[PDB]
Design a protein around this ligand. Structure first.
Ligand code: DTP
Ligand code: CA
Ligand code: CA
Ligand code: FE
Length: 1103
DNA sequence: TAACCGCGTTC
DNA sequence: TCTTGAACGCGGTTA
């Protein structure tokens, strides 16, 4: 009888909705026809849909429905409710007796079943479905979702009893109605998702809510303007510890409402009363802040809640407020006798996040984590602000925040205000357009669209297409607890992914010549291919015709000439062209080209290859069962082995099968790779393929607008500062949008391996990867015969080409326009489209007679960027090994184009190494010769080497603690690391012993540590000191370092005598080895930093 | 030496 | 409850 709690919540929410301007609107009745063409004549109210939530109504037992929250055209708001019977299907293993099952379930489920009906859907796993045969199903409908769940608990025993055997009757011997029910289907669709899909309603669109239903008003283009508030709180904190919502108070709540800044203060903690000030960190971000200097903390909370209730916001934005700000305000409200739910309608939900019915909570940190495409080291609000808004917000050390309420109150008021400015404007410029536009195609509310994984987002879009094509949803995938290969227990199985090669290291600049040896037969091939490749660049790449171009021969003659000149002199020493070629939407286009989709893996048969890789124990079956019977006889946490769960059973089996295999085979795990083939039907209902093609086209629009505005900008004179400032803003705006669509797009590839995937196919994912590896290696084979490829990753190639190699040309058409042509790009694309096009792609031409056509499909194109000014690739310390996924590339104007992989970019590495790498990549541009180039990097190296060889005596204390520090995050809590050794685990354990157990209470703690010299010759994980120790009082300090260095002798407590300076001298040393010296050796110049000795294998090679 | 792990990247 | 994939670098431990 849980409807009590549910019907109550609906009443409470209904009243909270009314207080915030959302009273349930019921449209006037209409007896005329229901056509969208006469929208202006049908009685009703038009609004912009801003939110939606499942609810229970009481005949206006509970009745399932969805509240839809609207903003109307006349500055007001309202909500409307649609009711819809929840439902799922019953499948039968013989469609001749469906009416018998129908009579069974009508009586078996009569306690909760509302109505019943036989319907037909298309089953993609059913024979003859491509000819029109459909699966017959029983549609069970219910009054509310509680009744649906009851029928599930009632049907599950039947489904489990039919999968078990039968019973002991006359052993000397038409089937029961219960054994005919094969499975239940579409039983786990969220209700409001079910309503959103079935009724074709989306947040962000305009509707007219009439008696017949919602009529989309396609005349209304732009989004309505909700009132948006972003807030940030600041609280007191113990020195070197974390805020505790029990003890610590809230100093101030800064916020902003549609541009107007505000600030509530807690005069009981903030010493002064602050006057109205301004923070406009850039002209485009005004920030006039009105302050509410209040007395008590209760006064502060009550003004915040009162201000919320009066402005009536439908969007409240925060930065990580879901797991700090909101629970802090809620805990302070409870302590102070204020129920936050009665006040503002917010409350925690099942995941601990804070939501409301009328107002979406947009935690910008969720957007940053999923869609911003920033590295984790740049996901703090400070880095996000300078990357996305283009300015540096106000900083100050958090250790000084609790004191500065008393000492420098105005400065700390400026910080809290800058956080509110950065949060509000990042939401309005980035989070708000993206998520609300996303809601128009994904059947979720803004809160869910922001937070769900990209795989779940893909699943939502796929369920819309499947439903609209009457395709039965597959049930969620389930992986078996045990799988075997050749009798061996499998520990993990997967496929071979992308192909990555590190081919050359060192420095390559457009002003420094390189030596090329051009394969003459390679130029022979491109000459034979040149006529049809230029036609390909004209007709396929630029979608034109050779008839309308006027310099086809002139450009063909210009390329053949250069082609021929480079064939005669195949040995050259010229300046290079630093180029990058990269397939646009590689895996998506590989899928759509070959018609890849889970339901297509089974002449409509396209056989494509993939590579399965398995990891299994060396033990065979004879030893498996031996360990099992052993584990069976032992006791467990009062319980037997067979009385455990199958999961806990295999847990113990795996633990004891690792120990055995180690002591008998010397190994614990064997890996093997087998080439597998799969049949890809080229006629299957392409609802999956088409969904990918649609979203890829969606992303392509923003990707092309970024390229346009990168062109509009360079065509603007450097003097027009305002024009070029606005062009650069659209550039970062469209780059952000296309990057936000990139992860969702590629999750269509990843979704086929996601746990619980409705369309799981390991085969399809492997085929995509192997096909990509085959294309990118064919491209390398041509580049290595024409130039020198430097690095290669999955679908991209960094290479240098002779300056004499044919480069960029522009066709001219009789219109007067121009067609762009990059010959290094089109020469590869022509080969792409000669060796990899799918000539077996089929589509329904006549659906009524089920006749198909067969056409040729290939949307795989390399895209080129460059030529660049410099590329700097590091080398490995070990002989012959390269360094993949790490380099630096610079533009012609000297700016950094790409910085990939290096510690400078990663979250929390050795800070000294970050500043070193930061100071050094710029200087690889200096110098006039390659040897002179390496001397400029040598000087900055020797500067950093000097700081360490001097034991940091040439830096002030605070710069030293900043420099030698290393920060590392612990993804889990310490207790989850039992049995493991690490510098983070040590730092966290020592932080807990000195600062208290509550320091490790939560996951994600940043362990900032220093590595001590003593105890000597001890493992490095034992000498990691929390840097917090040196800010504690001298008694508390000394006791712990004496403890941690095992030196009761010790009282020279200064950092410079504790640090293992030789350790950091090695860390910097190998950094200098990999970036500077070892690549310099591989380019043939003597060690530019002789204070960093070469490897023994490298010295021997120099002989 | 080589297998192995956690973190965080590049695709 | 939720829940895209694999390849890779590096500091560190372990067999
Ligand atoms: N985040 C991801 N999740 C799943 N697969 C990914 C992800 N990122 C990259 N991949 C895979 C699929 C991509 O097609 C393939 C090539 O990477 P990349 O070239 O960076 O993306 P892309 O080719 O789709 O975009 P672009 O058009 O910008 O090159 O790597
Ligand atoms: Ca803050
Ligand atoms: Ca790509
Ligand atoms: Fe087929």
């Amino acid at each position: 009888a849980l409807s009590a709690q549910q019907l109550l919540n609906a009443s409470k929410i209904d009243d909270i909705d009314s207080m915030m301007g959302f009273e349930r609107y019921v449209p006037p009745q209409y007896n005329g026809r229901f056509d969208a063409k006469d929208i202006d004549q049908i009685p009703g109210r038009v609004g912009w849909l801003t939110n939606m939530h499942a609810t229970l109504v009481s005949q206006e037992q509970g009745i399932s429905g969805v509240d839809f929250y609207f903003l109307d055209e006349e500055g007001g708001s309202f909500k409307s409710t649609v009711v819809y019977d929840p439902y799922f299907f019953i499948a039968c293993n013989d469609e001749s007796r469906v009416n018998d099952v129908e009579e069974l379930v009508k009586k078996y489920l009569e306690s909760c079943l509302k109505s019943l009906q036989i319907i037909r859907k298309e089953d993609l796993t059913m024979d003859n479905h491509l000819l029109g045969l459909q699966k017959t199903l029983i549609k069970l409908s219910f009054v509310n979702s509680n009744q649906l769940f009851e029928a599930r608990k009632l049907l599950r025993p039947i489904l489990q009893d039919n999968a078990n055997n039968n019973v002991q009757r006359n052993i000397y011997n038409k089937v029961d109605a219960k054994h005919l029910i094969e499975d239940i289907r579409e039983y786990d669709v969220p209700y409001h998702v079910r309503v959103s899909i079935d009724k074709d309603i989306r947040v962000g669109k305009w509707y007219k809510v009439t008696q017949q239903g919602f009529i989309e008003d396609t005349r209304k283009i732009a989004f309505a303007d909700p009132v948006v508030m972003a807030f940030d709180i600041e609280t007191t904190k113990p020195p070197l510890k974390f805020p505790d919502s029990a003890v610590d108070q809230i100093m101030m709540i800064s916020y902003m409402i549609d541009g107007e800044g505000f600030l509530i203060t807690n005069r009981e903690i903030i010493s002064e009363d602050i006057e109205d000030f301004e923070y406009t960190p850039k002209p485009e971000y005004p920030g006039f802040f009105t302050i509410f200097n209040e007395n008590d903390e209760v006064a502060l909370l009550q003004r915040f809640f009162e201000h919320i209730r009066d402005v009536r916001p439908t969007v409240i934005s925060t930065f990580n407020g879901d797991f700090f700000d909101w629970p802090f305000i809620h805990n302070r409200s409870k302590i102070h006798g204020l129920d936050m739910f009665d006040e503002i309608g917010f409350a925690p939900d099942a995941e601990g996040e804070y939501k409301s019915s009328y107002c979406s909570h947009m935690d910008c940190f969720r957007w940053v984590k999923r869609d911003s495409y920033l590295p984790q080291g740049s996901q703090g609000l400070k880095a996000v602000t300078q990357s996305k808004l283009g300015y540096n917000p106000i900083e100050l050390d958090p250790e000084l925040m609790t004191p500065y309420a008393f000492e420098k109150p105005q400065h700390l008021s400026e910080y809290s205000v800058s956080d509110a400015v950065a949060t509000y404007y990042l939401y309005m410029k980035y989070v708000h357009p993206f998520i609300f536009s996303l809601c128009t195609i994904i059947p979720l509310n803004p809160d869910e669209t922001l937070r769900k994984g990209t795989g779940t987002l893909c699943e939502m879009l796929l369920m819309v297409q499947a439903y609209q094509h009457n395709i039965l949803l597959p049930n969620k995938h389930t992986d078996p607890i045990e799988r075997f290969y050749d009798g061996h227990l499998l520990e993990s199985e997967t496929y071979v992914g992308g192909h990555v090669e590190s081919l050359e290291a060192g420095v390559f600049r457009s002003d420094l010549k390189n030596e090329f040896k051009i394969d003459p037969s390679a130029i022979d091939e491109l000459l034979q291919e040149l006529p049809e490749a230029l036609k390909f660049s004209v007709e396929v790449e630029n979608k034109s015709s050779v008839d309308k171009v006027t310099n086809f021969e002139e450009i063909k003659n210009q390329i053949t000439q250069k082609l021929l000149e480079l064939k005669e002199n195949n040995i050259r020493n010229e300046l290079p062209l630093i180029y990058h070629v990269d397939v646009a939407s590689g895996y998506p286009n590989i899928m759509t080209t070959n018609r890849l989709q889970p339901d297509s893996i089974k002449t409509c048969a396209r056989k494509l290859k993939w590579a399965w890789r398995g990891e299994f124990f060396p033990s065979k079956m004879d030893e498996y069962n031996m360990i099992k019977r052993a584990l069976q006889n032992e006791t467990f946490p009062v319980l037997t082995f067979d009385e455990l769960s199958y999961a806990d059973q295999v847990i113990h089996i795996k633990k004891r099968l690792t120990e055995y295999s180690r002591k008998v085979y010397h190994r614990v795990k064997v890996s093997e790779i087998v080439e597998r083939e799969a049949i890809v039907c080229q006629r299957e209902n392409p609802f999956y393929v088409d969904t990918v093609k649609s979203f890829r086209d969606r992303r392509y629009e923003f990707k092309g607008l970024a390229k346009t505005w990168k062109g509009n900008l360079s065509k603007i004179d450097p003097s027009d500062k305002h024009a070029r400032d606005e062009a650069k803003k659209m550039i970062v705006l469209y780059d952000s949008l296309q990057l936000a669509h990139k992860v969702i797009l590629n999750s269509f590839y990843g979704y086929v391996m996601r746990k619980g995937s409705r369309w799981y196919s390991m085969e399809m994912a492997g085929i995509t990867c192997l096909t990509g590896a085959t294309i990118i290696q064919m491209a390398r084979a041509l580049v290595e015969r024409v130039g020198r490829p430097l690095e290669l990753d999955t679908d991209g190639i960094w290479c240098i080409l002779p300056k004499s190699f044919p480069e960029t040309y522009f066709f001219t058409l009789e219109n007067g326009k121009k067609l762009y042509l990059s010959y290094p790009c089109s020469m590869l694309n022509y080969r792409v489209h000669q060796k990899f096009t799918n000539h077996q792609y089929q589509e329904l031409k006549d659906p009524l007679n089920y006749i198909y056509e067969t056409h040729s499909e290939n949307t795989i194109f390399f895209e080129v960027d460059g030529p660049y000014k410099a590329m700097i690739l590091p080398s490995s310390k070990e002989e012959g090994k390269g360094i993949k996924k790490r380099y630096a590339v610079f533009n012609e104007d000297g700016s950094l184009a790409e910085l990939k992989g290096f510690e400078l970019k990663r979250r929390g590495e050795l800070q000294l190494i970050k500043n070193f790498q930061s100071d050094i990549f710029k200087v690889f541009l200096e110098g006039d010769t390659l040897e002179g180039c390496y001397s400029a990097v040598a000087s900055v190296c020797n500067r950093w080497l000097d700081v360490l060889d001097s034991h940091g005596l040439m830096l002030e204390d605070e710069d030293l603690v900043s420099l030698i520090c290393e920060n590392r995050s612990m993804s889990k809590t310490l207790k989850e690391y039992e049995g493991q050794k690490s510098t983070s685990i040590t730092t966290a354990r020592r932080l807990g012993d000195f600062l208290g157990e509550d320091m490790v209470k939560d996951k994600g703690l940043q362990c900032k540590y220093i590595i001590s010299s003593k105890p000597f010759n001890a493992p490095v994980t034992e000498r990691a000191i929390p840097v917090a120790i040196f800010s504690a009082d001298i008694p508390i300090k000394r006791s712990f370092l004496r403890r941690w260095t095992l030196d009761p002798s010790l009282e020279d407590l200064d950092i410079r005598t504790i640090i293992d300076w030789g350790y950091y001298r090695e860390r910097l040393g190998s950094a200098i080895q990999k970036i500077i010296t070892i690549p310099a050796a591989l380019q043939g110049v003597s060690n530019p930093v002789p204070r960093v000795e070469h490897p023994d294998w490298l010295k021997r090679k120099i002989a």
